[model samples]
Target: GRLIYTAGGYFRQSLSYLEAYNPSNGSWLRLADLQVPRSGLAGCVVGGLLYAVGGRNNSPDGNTDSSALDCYNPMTNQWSPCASMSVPRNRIGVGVIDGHIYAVGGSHGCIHHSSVERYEPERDEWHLVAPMLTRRIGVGVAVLNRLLYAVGGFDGTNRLNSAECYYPERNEWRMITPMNTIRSGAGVCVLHNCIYAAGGYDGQDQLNSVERYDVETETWTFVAPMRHHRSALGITVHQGKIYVLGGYDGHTFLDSVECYDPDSDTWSEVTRMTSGRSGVGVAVTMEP
Candidate 1:
């Protein structure tokens, strides 16, 4: 199978792609660049189309808000604008279920946020959903079964170790087990019924600790940490293994990549990203 990801900003904002990688043969190829440059954004793929949601722009000492919803069709090698969101947000978290894309909490206009919205591809329109319980920026949102999960992020005054679950059927939010460590500006996703939370900052420092949340028991346990501390990266479960990619390490942005295998409780190095970034979004198009 192939994977698509965004290379975002750390020092500067730009967008690029790692077209495909074959682990069986260990090969990679780069694709075209995104039409615009932005980071601290979120992304998801549905019906073979890639949607890149809002993130901050390439600005120094400040944040840029974009309501831009960009979609890419690999079949045509083209990028087109989708319906605009009501609010422009950065450090966004997105999840997809039932062909509808759920764009969740993020920061904007210098305020932390908890509002969540839904995008219907056919109409290209956005609908407001139940807001998150915690107003956090740069949190992780992923879906497992019928529920959506929001993990570590900055909640105004501090980075958080908190996590929450949203149920659309009930249209309500429920508090779940908190992350082992508080972190913001990190990537999150679910693989094989296990929620993997890895790599983010803990206020005073960056972190490499990786933890897994068991939905059945509503508890979290430690897993092997990343090889290095990274913040603002993304996670994807490919071929029964988890891949962590593209984050910043304080002084420099990183294009390095690593993978985790729960079955073996091990980590392995893989191809590096073409660009380095922190506070980026990631999603994979795979069926459970």
Candidate 2:
């Protein structure tokens, strides 16, 4: 199985790739690398295609901008360019529903963004959808039911606790419950009807906290914290478990990977990655 993911920075950051972790054997293997080597981006898997959307290509300490949209096929080990997004953004978030790939808000420079672009893979086109209620960067995106949810990120002046969802059919975005903490560069995924947001920076400090949102109840509750406080980590849910990958710890880049089992409410180390990168993305392409 192939899980899509992102690399942290632009310019010199290594391209993101799929990691095959055989939980039964507790081992890991790297797959194909992304065609474009941009960072602070995000990804999603739909219809057997992995869409790598929006990232910065400039210097790490300099202003960031969105480059291009790149799509990778695990079965072919090849990459193809997709429709360019409407605007340039970094720390972007993504999700897919039906056949539409939704690229959400991210930062461009000193300002954060709230724009949304939806790409139709079948038609090879990109369309502007609803703009986010709050501008954000390093956002986490996930889809539950037919609704696509965009969670926490930085908004230039401060980290945000707000979250929003877009109804593709309605072409509208409505506000949702806010997170307990204001943070950016957090990782997000859906598991067991709950949305789990993990590992991010809270303005002045890094965070190890994990929070879960129950869509049914429209409320958020705390969960077990991550083993480490990381920013720009990648996250995905596969085979009834949630896997979190490497990120920056302020002082150093990390390759540490961990998995969380909601069934047990605990976290355990998986396998270290071959490289240390932050601001990455991850997705799982699986078929029943």
Candidate 3:
């Protein structure tokens, strides 16, 4: 398995850089750049291909965003444009279940959006899906126990701690218990049977706090905090541990990397990236 890191930015400069982390050697290798330079994009694995969806394109003033759907084929080390999204957005929440990738709440300019879309690689197309109950930006989405869960984010007016779940079979979304702390731009991933939410902003300050949801008990409990206060970072579960990538802390773009060992309930720093990044997207692929 390898962890693939993709597009992000430092300050107002959008980036096209891509890198991969190998756990076995504890090293990172440069990969092909994205077809378009972007930040605040949402990414996921669909049928063995990496899909980078709606995001803000190169805009130093932060005025531009896109609906372009570009896919990367590792086998060929090339990127190709696919069907675009219905709405142009950034800071979106993405989840994959079965063979489809679901793009959730995001923002267009200053307005938070609640629209959602489903993409099928086989058809090379996208269609509207049930939108999220809350309009949001900086949200996080992960699949847990076969269901898709959307976590906290900014509602354009306030930071949120609320969460909800989507049942694809019923084509419905239901509210779930809220997190203890409000956050936006946080990283979320599923490990074993529980969903974990990591560092993010709380309107005023950056946070290093982390929490986990107990599915059986239907409750959220605080876990070990990360070594650095971060938001807008990329996160995923690999080999049972949580890998947190580059992000910002309000004052600076961060290149530092960290991991959480659930077995020890502790956070440990790992190798840092060559450059600082924020609003990044992360995905993991296992060898066949």
Candidate 4:
């Protein structure tokens, strides 16, 4: 069975809460909490272990920048500290490929950042990479065609429709065809060799509009939209389906969840979380 885990997120303050959804039974399981409570964090599974990346946290000194990185061993049900980023980031997007985790653009509260960093697990170090073209927050980062993509984000001034991809061979980011509309906090994942951007907040409102990017032609086309408007939602690909977790609407936080079926090109409401929240960290770990 596939387990989708929703980690710490905004709930009054950053939460230590961790919950997992078992797709087989459509059941939600309470799991081990994070060592450092965080919101706007990124969850990534590497080598069967869960890693929580940058975000906002409820720290004693009131420094909300979630700089710490920790790894969760499902076997032991414990989180161990790895290290921290030099520049603390919130809402950063992280993706693991080639045994290294890439941390993309994010914010330090107000200022959106354009930097990129690659995590070396063996050395426990974060090495700077070629920075992005624009400073972005809530950008969606995903790997497709073995390349890392930095999608739409709030670029301080406005929600960006701009997107780019990184080529590790040259260690640089190149612009890609923009999406159909502006988006920030979009849930993104690769499906059927195409990049899909789900619910997000444009400059003005939360959107249910979803789109697909065809790498072959380098163009984006509209796809089935989610049932609910969402921003800062958690997205993961499992069993050929695109699963989106809780998010925020303009009025209130959300607890609803939805998934997209590519074959039918339709979206369906699957399950709901225990609490209304957004900016949550989502991790997918198969029962190994």
User: Sort by lDDT, best first: what order?
Assistant: 4, 3, 2, 1
Candidate closer to the true structure by TM-score (higher is better), 1 or 3: 3
Q: What is the C-alpha lDDT profile of model 1 across 1-288, one tens digit per residue?
A: 556454345456444442444555565555555666677778888898878888767655555686778887767767788898879878888888899988877888778888989899999999998888899888888899978998989878889999999998998988998887988977688887778888888998878888888898888888888887888887776777888877877777787778987878888788776556565555554211
Who is ahead in TM-score, 3 or 4?
4
Clash counts for all predictions? 1, 8, 0, 0
Q: How high is each candidate's TM-score?
A: 0.92, 0.91, 0.95, 0.96
198: Cα error in model 4, Å = 0.9
Instruction: For residues 1-288, write the lDDT of model 2, one tens digit per residue.
Output: 444344334225445455555555665666666665667878777787777778875444554476478877766767788778888878888888888888888877776788888888878888887798888788888889979998988777778889988887888889899999876888898998998899788888778899999999999998999898888888887789988888887777877888998978999888877677676767767411
The predicted structure with the larger lDDT, 1 or 3, is: 3
**Alpha-carbon RMSD of each model:** 2.6, 2.7, 1.7, 1.5
What is the alpha-carbon lDDT for the whole of candidate 3?
Answer: 0.84
Name model 3 segments beyond 4 Å from true.
286-288
lDDT of 4 by residue, 194-285 (tens): 88888888878999999989999999999988888999999998788899998888877889989888889888889989999898989789
**Candidate 3 lDDT, 102-202, residue by residue in tens:** 88888888879888889888898999988789887899898987798989999999999999998888888888999999989999899988889998889
CA-lDDT, candidates in order: 0.77, 0.78, 0.84, 0.87
TM-score of 1: 0.92
Best by TM-score: 4
TM-score of 4: 0.96
